[PDB]
Write a protein that binds this ligand. Structure first.
Ligand SMILES: CCC(CC)CN(C[C@@H](O)[C@H](Cc1ccccc1)NC(=O)O[C@H]1CO[C@H]2OCC[C@H]21)S(=O)(=O)c1ccc(N)cc1
Lengths: 99, 99
């Protein structure tokens, strides 16, 4: 599909039994999801943006479905105000910028 | 162009005769540039990112050429970690997401 940018590029994602709305975010290196108690091993990380840093948990090889497209990879989890699909998964679903 | 996302979508912009590198950021509502001088009136504003809120200077109707495409719109100047082109100007240059 083609998503214009007149509004925030929010799409439906699924991670296990949770459907969520998330931004398709070319400015994010890695996917960051709102706090959720995912199973499995993780490592602490701090990620930085406007306003400073937040602490997140890095989970690897997590399957996520994004608008019906399958992805699997690193998912950061922490107190972000918005769910963010970053470049690590945008490439897996075939997403490009075009102008 | 078509821009894939295996690397950061950094592009050269021209603003006030100056060449800068900026990140095409679909998860940003607004265009935010690192500290720089711009002419004319500005308004104090605050904006929030992943790590909290910052103070910025809001300049309206500023021309920026983004990868050869002309925009004229609002530019916020302040302590962003990197220069970002947000949706306010991505829409003007006809940028969409495609997958
Ligand atoms: C270092 C480059 C940017 C910050 C500049 C990185 N951000 C993604 C960005 O798209 C963010 C994503 C974002 C969206 C909404 C809330 C927080 C973050 N947007 C953002 O800060 O936009 C601000 C400018 O316009 C405004 O509209 C949205 C917030 C304002 S981020 O959220 O801080 C971020 C950093 C690291 C990872 N892995 C994932 C995300």
């Amino acid at each position: 599909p083609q998503i214009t940018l007149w509004k925030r590029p929010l799409v439906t994602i699924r991670i296990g039994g949770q459907l969520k709305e998330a931004l398709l975010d070319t400015g994010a290196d890695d996917t960051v999801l709102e706090e959720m108690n995912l199973p499995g091993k993780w490592k602490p990380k701090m990620i930085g943006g406007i306003g400073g840093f937040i602490k997140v948990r890095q989970y690897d090889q997590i399957p996520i479905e994004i608008c019906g497209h399958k992805a699997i990879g690193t998912v950061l989890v922490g107190p972000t105000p918005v769910n963010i699909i970053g470049r690590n998964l945008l490439t897996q679903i075939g997403c490009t910028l075009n102008f």
